[PDB]
Structure formats: structure tokens, C-alpha cells
């Protein structure tokens, strides 16, 4: 291996010599295996579970429970502090299990999309994992490529390679293949940077930890994850609930002390109530729902790189897509040639190969048989930076189609017969690409310039055109017939490139047009239909012509018979507010630069929407980052996009974006279920103790009974409600608004109904057993079992807000069944098992008492089912 500054200093042949690097053909299988045995794989060694377990204790509510347990052991109450500790342990353990499983499934899916590169080893260019690179191997750099290892570039026809990840400067750096005598390495392609423009070939000088900038990646792995917005808003909700409960419980302590009661019993009851009503399981249930959504998208094949996406996908309503790479498979092919004179050539065959003849007037043309078709093909061949090596394209698909056309014409060799002194490279702002070239053998020939691009810019740069091999000044009737043919090509679905060639820019000769057919991606039509039917709008932001964009959108189904399409120049002309009004009506945006695409994304974000931009292409990373949800394509996608994206579709399907929206929808509903259950039962217990202190009645519950209740209503029975599956009715619902608004008037009203029924039934049992005016253990036992059975019925009815219990079914939620079974068993143990009787201050009951308690406590289930049916019938 060599240092990068050394490899910059020494010449290319020297660097090839030290690594025994064959620049033309690469390292064979044995040459690599040897360097793999010596140097090893390219991975950054091995990337802590106990750190995660302790990190789950960073939640403030867990600290509030730990402080209560510390206060418990101060005034020693072993049983209370132990109970609070078990509560913390089960909630933290369930959060650990869910987070660990989610992150391991995410790592496996990330293994399903490995880093890759184009490496030539046996003289043949192959797709080889960046992990498998050994030093001295020959790697070919395309456009939009992450550099697989530290490389020594020995061929750089044109190269712009950003350095924002490594250096911190967003400006791309040009790389020249000349040796650099004595960050500033203008010849070394670093590790982890991205190729913005051009083609290259290099030899790798480092593998593994040998990379100079491996440390910024070391920091990137250990960057950690900031708290999710929901995780900040449900944390604030938990603090609000905790502080309201603190005020109420302090008032209860003061009332109980003033009215006359045991200070130790009052303090223990206050500590148990504080532990109860603090939503310790609320951040845990948010974490569980986010992790479960992450795994559910992983089963849907979507690499969710960022956690704040999982919730945001529920709120997504507008999806802005790109024609090429996203709505079309990007398998371009030039099929129709329109010569400037008016002749028409039909290029048969498909794919990036030289297989398929060009037919003009029913006759095959080869070489320079027709000089004008040959001139079009020659300009297309020379102008590209894309190469079809071993039947595999490197560069852009639109350039590769022109290369394959040249190979079909027998004229692929003209690329190497010219010397590209100056290059005006493609930018989406430009919409054209030009090259200055001189013929090899004919050095006396002038610096002829080849040009290709969008018809508008090309025809603007041409002052002359060609006619029967004669240069003629451009005429407006010819411009009109070219415009008609370009529009007719686009209306058939052909992407159209116009081609020019001449001495000096601004004086080129317009040779003609080529029609690149890009079929729309299979499965996009049906997914678009479903996506629109589910209340999500799909738009087509593009840089291509109106005719092509509209033809593709009509075939996909997002452009109806009466639909609006707006060019990017109008969007530039219209203000942001006018764009904001018009933008929900426009389905197709054509001729939009990445600045215009960002303008469209900003204008839909200003309307109050969550935009999910799906992107492909090097310049489309800024819009993917600017979107609320950047979505990339795992298989047919550049690494530039997949780095900037937020969710990566592994199998390249638009149905996955719907599934990611459905899973994001379900998370908020599950959190609503937890919130309603915990709040109803905590208000029930809190007002029971409040009424008991106010009316001077004996306390229906002691401190350890409230601690068992807290383990019930924040532990596995309450977490089960956050594991509750999603129903179909909320699936087709209009998109959730991006504000949280978790506690709605309907939810609080049902909470108060459940709290009122629980308090009423439990106080009725308490008074019924207290009618004899004797405070026997049996009475407190009946009251405690009443509250616990009320809790299990409130949990049966808290699973779904709208759907009835019987329609949902008991077998639907397995964790809920296990949790309620364990809670019933624990309650039976507290009633019957004599040591548990001694600690909980209980006494055994008859079977008839349990039957009566079940019958009474069914009231919350009955009333909740009644309200569900009433709301359903009112909706119907």
C-alpha cells in the first residue's frame, strides 16, 4: 500500500509498479487473493449493547421513576422500590428488544444493498463489491459514483468529484491525471467522495483502515441519532401529564394530611400514585411503534435510513417524481433519427449493444453510406463521456444510447479519433453539452465542435444547418419543420436530443434529431392508481419536453384528459404565491431545472403538505434532500441519490411508497391507543384516591396495589396496545395532518367515560362491602380486583377507537392476550397466594365474588362498544 501524498508525488507508472498494478487489464484472481490474504478486506474493522441499555435510561421519566424508588429506599419500603424497579426493567427491556431487532433487520437490508463499483480485473469490467477491493486493482469511475477506495487516477477525460463529505466544501473538485509534485491532491480520488461529472480509471492505493480520511467515517458511524420530533413531542406530553399528576397528588397529600391520616401511608400512596400516573411507557411505546414500522418497511423492502421518516410517511400527501430513472426504467434506446434535410432513419434493436441495423427508406445504412445520418451519429458518439465496456454502460443512459447507436452504425471508433482539448460539460441548467475536438490524423483540421442537448438550446446555438451535404444559413421554415418533428416525436413517447457540429460555439450546423425511447417502468401505473385512490397526489417534475413528459404521464395515468402541465420557465416567471395556488392543479412539470424542482418542492411545502420527492441523477440530490422524504431507487440508482435519500426501495417498486405511508399512518393510531388506555386508568385511580381522601373513606388501594396497577397500565398490557396491528379503514383514510394533536376531543371524551365508569363501579363495590362498617381485608381485595378487572376491560376496549371489540377479535393481538393472561394470573396470585396476601394486604375471595366483579367490570366494554356502534351508524 502507499500513502496518498506519496502516490500524488510519484508518477503513475511508479505507482503501478509498487502495487504491481496492470492499468489496462487489472489484477487476476490469484493476484487479488494474495493481496486479500496480506491486506484484507476493505471494511472499517468492526463497528455496544450495554451502551444502548444504559442509554435507554436517559429518558427523563425513567429518571423520575428512579428518583421515586430512591425516595422509597430512603424511608425504607423495600417492596415499593422493588416494584418500581421491575416496572423500569420491563419497559426498558421491551424498548431494547424492539430497537435491537429493528436495527439488526435494517443492517441485514443494508447488506442486501451493498456498496459496489466497476472494477476491471481479468481485462473485463465487472460490478465488484467495494468491500472486495484489494490495493493495486483497477477501478473505473462513472458519473454519480461513490469512490470505492482511495484511488490513483490514471485516466481522467473529464472529472468533477465533490468533497463535502470529506473536506467540507460543497464545490466539486476537478481531477487531472497528471502527477502532482510536492485535500489538495488534484490527482488522487479519495475514499467516500462522489463523482459529479465525467469518466475515470484509477488504481487503488489503500484498502481497509489504510484510507487517509477513514476517521470522518469512524465519527459518522458513531454520530448517534438525535431524538425524533414525535419522540420530543411525546416526551413533552409525558412531562405535561407527569406535572399535572404531580399537582393533583400534592393536593391530595395536603388534603389527606389536613383531614387527618397516617403520614407514612399518605407518603407511600403519593409515591405509588406518582409512579403510576407518570407515562413511563409513553416514550417506550413511541420507540416500539417506530421500530415496528421500520421492520414493517424492511419486510416491504425499503431501507429506512432515517428514523424521522417513519412517522413523516404517514403525513405524506404529495409525491413529486422524476420521469427518467423513477417513472421510466432508464433503459434508453435511440430508435428514430430525423435528419435535418427530412430523411427518416429507423434504428432497430434494443439495449446498449451494437446489435440492430439502421434502416433508411427500407435500406440498411452502414458506415458513411448516408453522410448526414453518419454525421448525427458521429456527433452523438464523440460528445459522450459514457462507455459500453463488455456490454455494460458506465455513464448516463442517454449518452449510452448514442454510444450504442454509433456502435450499431459501425462508427464507434470516432470517439478515439478526436482529442478533446476543451469540454463544455452538461449541466441541467445548460440543457446542452459540447466538446472541442481535432482529428488525430488530420491535425490540420480545425477545432470542430460537437453539440447535443435539448432542441431549444441546440437550435439557439446553431446559425447554419445542413442540406444534401451543403452548409446553408438557418431558415425559420426549417426551424418550424424541426419543431413539428420534435413535438411529434415527443408525443409518441420518444425522448428527443438535437445535435449540432461546427467551427466554434454559436456557429454550429444543425444535423438533426434522435428519438430516445424510454419505456415507463412496469408497475408504476397500478401503484399510481392506488396512490391517487388513497388520497395521495402524484406529480411529475421533469427536465424533458412537454410532449415526452405528457405522453409518459398519460400512459402512466397521472395525466387525465383534462389536466394541466406547466413548463419550468413559467414557474420561474410566476411568484412563489402564484405557484402555490397553481401547483396542486398541475400534474406534469416539464423543462424544470433542479432550481425549479426545488422551487416546486418548496411551494408544495408552503401549502401545508409533506412532499416525498423520488429522485435519480447527480443533480437531483439537492431536491431529494430538500424534500420531506427523499426516496431513491436501490437497483437502478446512482450512489449520489442513495446517499442523500431517506428511504431506498430495494426492489424498485412504487407500491413500497404506499406501504411506507400505511405503516406511518398506523403508528399514530397505536400511540393513541396507549395514550387513551393509560390516561383513562390513571385518571380512574387518581380520582379514586382523591374521592377517598375528600370523603374520609378508607383508601380503596394501598401503595403496592397502585404499583401493581402501574405495572399493568404502563407495562406489557399497555405496550401491547402499541404493538396492535393496523386496520384497513384507517389505511384508505386521507393523509394524517403533520401536526401531532394526539389528544383529541373525542379521545378525551372516551377517556373520561371510561374513567367515570371505572370509578363508579369500583366505588360501588367498595361501598357494598363497606356497608357493614368493618374494614376487612376482603373489602380492599374486592376493590383492588374490581380496579384490575376494570383495567383489563379498558384494555380490551382500548385496542381500536372505531372498530368494535368483536370485529377486531381477541386472537388478533398475541402480545395483548399474553399480557392480559399474565395480569389476570398475577391478580389471582395477589388474591390467593398467602405471601402475596401478606405483602399486598389482601384476603382470598369466593368464586361468586369474582363472577360478580367480572360482570360489573364489563361495563366499560359494553359502553365503549355502544359508543363505537353509535359513531359507526352515525357515520353510515
Amino acid at each position, epitope marked *: 500500500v502507499l500513502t496518498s501524498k506519496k502516490a500524488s508525488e510519484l508518477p503513475v507508472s511508479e505507482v503501478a509498479s509498487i502495487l504491481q498494478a496492470d492499468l489496462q487489464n487489472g489484477l487476476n484472481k490469484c493476484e487479488v487473493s494474495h493481496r486479500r490474504a496480506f491486506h484484507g478486506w476493505n471494511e472499517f474493522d468492526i463497528s455496544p449493547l450495554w451502551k444502548k441499555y444504559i442509554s435507554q435510561f436517559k429518558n427523563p421519566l425513567i429518571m423520575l421513576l428512579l428518583a421515586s424508588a430512591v425516595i422509597s429506599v430512603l424511608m425504607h419500603q423495600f417492596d415499593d422500590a422493588v416494584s418500581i424497579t421491575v416496572a423500569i426493567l420491563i419497559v426498558v427491556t421491551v424498548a431494547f428488544v424492539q430497537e435491537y431487532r429493528s436495527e439488526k433487520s435494517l443492517e441485514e437490508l443494508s447488506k442486501l444493498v451493498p456498496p459496489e463499483c466497476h472494477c476491471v480485473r481479468e481485462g473485463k469490467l465487472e460490478h465488484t463489491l467495494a468491500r472486495d477491493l484489494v490495493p493495486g486493482d483497477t477501478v473505473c469511475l462513472s458519473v454519480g459514483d461513490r469512490v470505492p477506495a482511495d484511488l490513483r487516477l490514471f485516466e481522467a477525460v473529464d472529472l468533477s468529484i465533490d468533497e463535502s463529505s470529506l473536506t467540507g466544501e460543497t464545490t466539486p473538485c476537478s481531477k487531472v491525471t497528471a502527477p502532482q509534485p510536492a485535500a489538495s491532491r488534484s490527482n488522487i480520488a479519495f475514499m467516500g467522495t462522489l463523482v459529479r461529472c465525467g469518466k475515470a480509471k484509477g488504481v487503488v492505493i489503500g484498502t481497509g483502515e489504510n484510507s487517509e480520511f477513514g476517521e470522518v467515517f469512524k465519527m459518522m458511524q458513531a454520530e448517534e441519532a438525535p431524538k425524533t420530533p414525535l419522540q420530543k413531542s411525546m416526551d413533552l406530553l409525558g412531562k405535561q401529564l407527569s406535572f399535572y399528576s404531580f399537582g393533583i397528588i400534592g393536593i391530595i397529600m395536603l388534603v389527606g394530611w389536613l383531614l387527618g391520616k397516617d403520614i407514612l401511608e399518605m407518603f407511600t400512596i403519593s409515591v405509588s400514585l406518582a409512579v403510576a400516573a407518570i407515562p413511563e411507557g409513553l416514550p417506550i411505546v413511541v420507540t416500539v411503534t417506530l421500530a415496528l414500522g421500520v421492520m414493517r418497511m424492511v419486510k416491504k423492502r425499503a431501507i429506512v435510513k432515517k428514523l424521522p421518516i417513519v412517522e413523516t410517511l404517514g403525513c405524506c400527501n404529495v409525491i413529486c417524481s422524476d420521469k427518467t430513472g423513477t417513472l421510466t426504467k432508464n433503459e434508453m434506446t435511440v430508435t428514430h433519427i430525423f435528419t435535418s434535410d427530412g430523411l427518416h432513419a429507423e434504428v432497430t434493436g434494443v439495449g446498449y449493444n451494437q446489435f440492430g441495423e439502421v434502416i433508411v427508406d427500407g435500406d440498411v445504412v452502414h458506415g458513411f453510406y448516408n453522410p448526414a445520418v453518419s454525421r448525427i451519429v458521429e456527433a452523438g458518439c464523440v460528445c459522450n463521456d459514457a462507455v459500453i465496456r463488455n456490454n455494460t454502460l458506465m455513464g448516463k443512459p442517454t449518452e449510452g444510447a448514442l454510444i450504442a447507436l454509433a456502435m450499431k452504425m459501425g462508427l464507434d471508433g470516432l470517439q478515439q479519433d478526436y482529442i478533446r482539448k476543451a469540454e463544455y460539460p452538461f449541466s441541467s441548467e445548460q440543457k446542452w453539452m459540447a466538446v472541442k475536438c481535432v482529428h488525430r490524423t488530420q491535425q490540420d483540421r480545425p477545432e470542430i465542435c460537437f453539440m447535443k442537448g435539448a432542441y431549444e438550446q441546440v437550435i439557439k446555438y446553431c446559425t447554419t444547418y445542413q442540406s444534401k451535404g451543403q452548409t446553408l444559413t438557418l431558415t425559420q421554415q426549417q426551424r418550424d419543420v424541426y419543431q413539428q418533428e420534435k413535438a*411529434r416525436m415527443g408525443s409518441a413517447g420518444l425522448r428527443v436530443l438535437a445535435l449540432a457540429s461546427g467551427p466554434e460555439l454559436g456557429q454550429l450546423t444543425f444535423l438533426g434529431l434522435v428519438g430516445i425511447i424510454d419505456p415507463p417502468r412496469t408497475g408504476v401505473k397500478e401503484a399510481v392508481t392506488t396512490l391517487i385512490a388513497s388520497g395521495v397526489s402524484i406529480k411529475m417534475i421533469t427536465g424533458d419536453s412537454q410532449e415526452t413528459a405528457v405522453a409518459i404521464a398519460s400512459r402512466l395515468g397521472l395525466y387525465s384528459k383534462t389536466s394541466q402541465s406547466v413548463s419550468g420557465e413559467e414557474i420561474d416567471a410566476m411568484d412563489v404565491q402564484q405557484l402555490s395556488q397553481i401547483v396542486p392543479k398541475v400534474a406534469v412539470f416539464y423543462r424544470a431545472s433542479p432550481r425549479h424542482k426545488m422551487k416546486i418542492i418548496k411551494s408544495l411545502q408552503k401549502n401545508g403538505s409533506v412532499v416525498a420527492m423520488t429522485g435519480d441523477g447527480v443533480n437531483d440530490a439537492v431536491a431529494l434532500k430538500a424534500a420531506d422524504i427523499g426516496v431513491a431507487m436501490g437497483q437502478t440508482g446512482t450512489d449520489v441519490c442513495k446517499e442523500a435519500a431517506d428511504m431506498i426501495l430495494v426492489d424498485d417498486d412504487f407500491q413500497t411508497i404506499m406501504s411506507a405511508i400505511e405503516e406511518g399512518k398506523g403508528i399514530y393510531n397505536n400511540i393513541k391507543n396507549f395514550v387513551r388506555f393509560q390516561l383513562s386508568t390513571s385518571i380512574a385511580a387518581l380520582t379514586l384516591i382523591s374521592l377517598a381522601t375528600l370523603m374520609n373513606f378508607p383508601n380503596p388501594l394501598n401503595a403496592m396495589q397502585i404499583l401493581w396497577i402501574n405495572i399493568i397500565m404502563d407495562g406489557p398490557p399497555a405496550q401491547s396496545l402499541g404493538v396492535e396491528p393496523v386496520d384497513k379503514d384507517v389505511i384508505r383514510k386521507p393523509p394524517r395532518n403533520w401536526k401531532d394533536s394526539i389528544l383529541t376531543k373525542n379521545l378525551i371524551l372516551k377517556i373520561l367515560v371510561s374513567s367515570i365508569i371505572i370509578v363508579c363501579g369500583t366505588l360501588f363495590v367498595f361501598w357494598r362491602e363497606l356497608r357493614d362498617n368493618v374494614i376487612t381485608p376482603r373489602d380492599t381485595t374486592m376493590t383492588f380486583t374490581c380496579f384490575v378487572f376494570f383495567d383489563m376491560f379498558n384494555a380490551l376496549s382500548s385496542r381500536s377507537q372505531t372498530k368494535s371489540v368483536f370485529e377486531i377479535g381477541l386472537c388478533s393481538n398475541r402480545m395483548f392476550c399474553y399480557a392480559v393472561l399474565g395480569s389476570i394470573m398475577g391478580q389471582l396470585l395477589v388474591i390467593y397466594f398467602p405471601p402475596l396476601q401478606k405483602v399486598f394486604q389482601t384476603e382470598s375471595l369466593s368464586i361468586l365474588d369474582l363472577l360478580f366483579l367480572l360482570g360489573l367490570t364489563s361495563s366499560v366494554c359494553i359502553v365503549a362498544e355502544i359508543i363505537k356502534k353509535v359513531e359507526r351508524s352515525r357515520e353510515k
Partner: nanobody
Amino acid sequence: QVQLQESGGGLVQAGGSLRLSCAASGSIFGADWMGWYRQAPGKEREFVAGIGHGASTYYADSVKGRFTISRDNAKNTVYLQMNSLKPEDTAVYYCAVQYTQYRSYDSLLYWGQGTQVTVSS
């Protein structure tokens, strides 16, 4: 509209002979170009063997000298023979036919449903 049907696919051993047939509903007279394409997972579809308008037969450079093609309008079916196949070059095969147009610029390209051939070592 012409309909393309693929047949003859099946399991064959190395060193044997494999038959494939692609039948078209319409008479194959005006169709200029027609040939097979090899699609494999992890890579783009690649050419197999085809015949063009000027009686010129195109073969893939890697599969050259081994795969043979023929056409007959009596049974309106193009007929492909695999000889001395390897386990490495097995994948799913699609027969595709193009037609000459020219006011409409829509490509008259017709694909087949495809038949999968799997050969192990």
C-alpha cells in the same frame, strides 16, 4: 395486433441440444428485425441471436459459434438451437420482433412472455 408465444423451454444438460420456438400470429414478411434476448438477475438483458432485413444474422460475441437461428413463414415461428451450453450462460429468454414504420413515431416492438432455463454445474 400480433401475438408472440414462446415454447420449447425446459431442463437440458450441458453438451446437449436445446430447442426454442417463438411463434407470431401474423405473417412474418414485413418484420425487419427479430431476435432473442437473455435476461439474468443482477444484470441487464443481453442479445442472444437474431435476423435482420437484409438476410444478415446477428450473434452475440460471447455466444457466437454456438447458438443458431432459423425462420420459416410456413409455421410463422422463429426457431433457435442451443448447442454445447454451459451452466454459466443460462437465464430467461425473451423473443422480440420489431417492425418498420412514418408519421407515427411509436415503435412497433413486440415482446414475448419469456421462458426460464436454469442449468446447474
